[PDB]
């Protein structure tokens with residue numbers, strides 16, 4: 074559920090970003106987007122990591138993703154019983 | 167065997183166990199064939215190998231091998247004469263003692279009947295040196311170490327001399343090797359002399375004896391003691407190769423301690439191979455300056471860019487210079503060099519059993535070390551992933567790279583790392599607070615694994631302690647029985663009389679075993695006899 | 704006191720491992736006296752200081768970094784120092800385990816023997832050190848014989864009380880053989 | 883089907899499951915369709931894990947034809 078929560082936030086960020094991408098090509102016509110003064114909502118997605126909101130879906134995604142990777146290696150507990158040397162070692166743990 | 171294996175394999179294993187239980191019976195062992203102690207030792211070894219192979223009835227085969235070991239030690243124990251002891255320790259050179267060491271029969275080697283035969287061989291040609299205090303023997307080691315070269319040249323005339331017999335004794339061989347090793351460690355310490363109180367000049371300054379020379383030739387030349395260390399290292403490397411050829415490459419890598427020792431000398435060779443390479447290039451530039459450019463002082467000369475490189479100081483040296491490769495490998499070797507005391511500490515009485523407990527815990531740590539690695543690698547990857555996108559945003563570059571994540575997590579085990587590695591300069595609390603949660607989870611986990619490691623080792627601990635040290639020291643003794651000079655000085659080029667003793671001892675074992683069986687059955691046997699008397703009358 | 708005696712044996716071992724890295728670490732960094740940020744392993748006296756306080760964790764981990772771009776020297780310093788730290792934990796853990804095993808009314812009698820030595824020093828030291836500057840067999844042989852008879856009797860009694868069944872069964876068998 | 887072994891696991895009768903009479907019946911089921919792989923060293927089994935990991939996709943597509951194939955029986959063993 075943490076892993077799903079990591080990618081659900083990631084997928085949500087994809088929908089909004091391509092929405093702003095669909096806006097720029099549709100209405101504002103220029104060779105370079107930098108010289109354009111975009112609408113404040115559309116111009117938000119042109120910002121870097123510095124200007125991102127604290128509760129951005131991508132930030133929610135990255136933290137949940139890292140937690141999942143920490144828990145992912147906890148699945149070795151399903152395999153260590155078979156090993157003879159590491160078998161009883163796990164039981165005491 | 168295949169037909170028996172096809173159906174009812176459980177009964178097949180049960181039959182094999184029963185047959186070996188019959189073979190490993192003390193009664194059958196004693197009455198089965200001549201020389202039952204050798205038969206018992208071989209059968210015990212076979213049972214131990216089968217216990218390794220089966221991995222299902224391991225306790226049964228360990229019990230049977232224990233029965234064989236008990237029979238061997240019991241047959242040895244009943245000896246009351248030295249001739250019986252000699253016959254048991256070697257059949258028709260300690261033949262049986264060496265074969266018992268190979269088969270891990272520790273109670274046989276450590277038995278008081280067996281030890282007293284080894285000490286007489288060990289302390290040969292010198293009787294009064296066994297009664298000396300440890301300080302006097304320490305004084306002897308100091309005396310031998312100081313006067314080692316003087317007696318070495320006298321070894322050529324030693325075979326005619328009386329003092330050669332004293333030198334050739336196993337204890338004087340051990341003293342020679344212990345004194346020789348002290349000398350080698352002294353050489354490394356003495357090779358670091360004049361830097362005990364620091365270097366005298368800063369690395370930014372180039373100092374040369376005469377202006378025409380190149381600076382690198384001054385630094386890369388071999389001093390007299392450093393040539394003496396290479397000869398010491400070459401002698402040890404020659405000895406290792408000879409043992410490798412005789413024993414074979416497969417058996418050589420089997421011992422983990424042997425792998426540790428061989429790599430140590432290969433490190434030392436790797437240290438001086440890089441050092442020698444730097445000497446060749448430096449003198450090449452030295453040969454260039456005197457040959458072509460003619461001046462009184464080399465400083466005023468604008469040299470070719472290749473030749474002018476070797477005139478630089480430590481500052482301008484390349485990162486992968488052969489001398490830098492040499493220095494790091496050399497330091498590693500010195501750390502491993504003091505690990506050779508493990509060959510000498512078994513002899514010491516006070517430090518003997520101390521070492522045995524040290525080795526036992528190290529074996530357990532490797533198992534936890536693998537577990538420590540798995541938990542370590544979990545957060546190492548986990549923490550590295552989270553912070554890899556805040557390389558410039560983080561105040562401290564701790565988890566920015568996978569190499570950096572390994573460093574900060576390892577030193578956290580010893581508490582040498584900071585807790586401010588999980589804070590950001592951006593206003594992203596979700597990323598930062600999750601970093602606290604994971605790092606706090608990691609720290610509690612390593613304590614749990616360390617605490618579990620401490621508890622498991624204590625349980626693994628439990629005259630069993632005493633006999634295991636005497637078995638380790640006995641292996642040390644037997645290496646010197648049949649290695650004359652130290653490695654530095656090694657470069658110069660009707661039944662029988664036996665079958666009567668065995669029969670007498672085996673009769674004694676059968677009698678005592680029957681006596682101890684019937685002495686435990688005095689009441690049961692007597693009550694049956696009187697009942698038959700009542701039935702008769 | 705009992706643990707202190709054991710520590711001395713490990714203290715010698717602690718010294719041998721300590722002196723191994725003390726010489727090993729000192730050799731590596733003695734040529735970067737000015738290049739190192741912290742003069743930790745520049746001298747053999749300095750190498751003894753930084754390694755000793757590491758046992759109590761009072762020393763830094765930045766003692767193995769250089770201001771020169773020589774990673775081979777620096778990374779080897781990390782490897783040795785990390786190897787040293789794991790080793791001292793192993794020796795300390797082994798020290799803790801060995802002491803626990805060495806522990807085992809034996810505990811009670813050993814204290815009373817130590818206190819009894821303290822008592823007997825005062826039986827036959829009058830004033831404190833500050834104030835000390837001013838200047839037929841026998842009646843015995845009857846008791847011993849009576850006690851030794853008691854010991855032989857009880858030892859025979861305890862031996863025969865443990866052998867009541869064995870002795871009785873032998874006597875009845877002789878009766879059967881007689882008749 | 884080990885009717886009583888499963889019922890003993892549920893009821894925590896550890897000495898019944900771990901008895902040498904009981905274990906040897908389980909290992910024969912575990913190491914089925916491959917006899918020589920029980921006698922291999924742990925490194926060889928580690929090599930087998932490395933071999934299987936690298937060639938896992940190639941044998942996966944062969945599982946459709948495996949029921950007719952002999953190598954499908956090896957794949958379907960509990961150890962594999």
Ligand SMILES: CC(C)CCC[C@@H](C)[C@H]1CC[C@H]2[C@@H]3CC=C4C[C@@H](OC(=O)CCC(=O)O)CC[C@]4(C)[C@H]3CC[C@]12C
Pocket residue numbers: 074077078079081082085128129130133
């Ligand atoms: C049995 C299975 C299907 C349970 C799976 C549960 C998830 C489908 C739910 C539970 C918690 C939910 C998450 C709670 C927190 C967030 C943060 C949220 O971030 C924001 O939208 C705020 C920023 C913004 O968009 O303005 C994005 C949705 C997400 C991932 C939610 C997505 C849907 C989640 C993962």
Ligand SMILES: CC(C)CCC[C@@H](C)[C@H]1CC[C@H]2[C@@H]3CC=C4C[C@@H](OC(=O)CCC(=O)O)CC[C@]4(C)[C@H]3CC[C@]12C
Pocket residue numbers: 149152153155156157539540543924927928931
């Ligand atoms: C690069 C490494 C140092 C980082 C950590 C990786 C480990 C967490 C992974 C990688 C390979 C894995 C190993 C691959 C091989 C096996 C075989 C398997 O054990 C057995 O062979 C069972 C015994 C049997 O077959 O009868 C599972 C444990 C183990 C050691 C695995 C344990 C987890 C390991 C060590």
Ligand SMILES: CC(C)CCC[C@@H](C)[C@H]1CC[C@H]2[C@@H]3CC=C4C[C@@H](OC(=O)CCC(=O)O)CC[C@]4(C)[C@H]3CC[C@]12C
Pocket residue numbers: 432435436437439440443486487488491
């Ligand atoms: C059984 C015995 C004989 C094994 C001994 C192995 C050595 C002879 C080999 C193994 C690794 C080799 C070393 C690998 C690394 C280096 C670094 C290398 O440094 C460089 O030459 C790069 C810098 C430069 O010269 O431009 C010098 C050779 C050296 C010491 C090699 C020398 C030869 C070594 C020590």
Ligand SMILES: CC(C)CCC[C@@H](C)[C@H]1CC[C@H]2[C@@H]3CC=C4C[C@@H](OC(=O)CCC(=O)O)CC[C@]4(C)[C@H]3CC[C@]12C
Pocket residue numbers: 300303304307344348507510511513514515718719722
């Ligand atoms: C300057 C010191 C404090 C730094 C560390 C040096 C030690 C690692 C070396 C130097 C002298 C060595 C000792 C010299 C004398 C001996 C005799 C020898 O032990 C025996 O006497 C064996 C018993 C016997 O002879 O029957 C080997 C251990 C020991 C203590 C050596 C152990 C290793 C020692 C202490």
Ligand SMILES: [Zn+2]
Pocket residue numbers: 167168
């Ligand atoms: Zn056969």
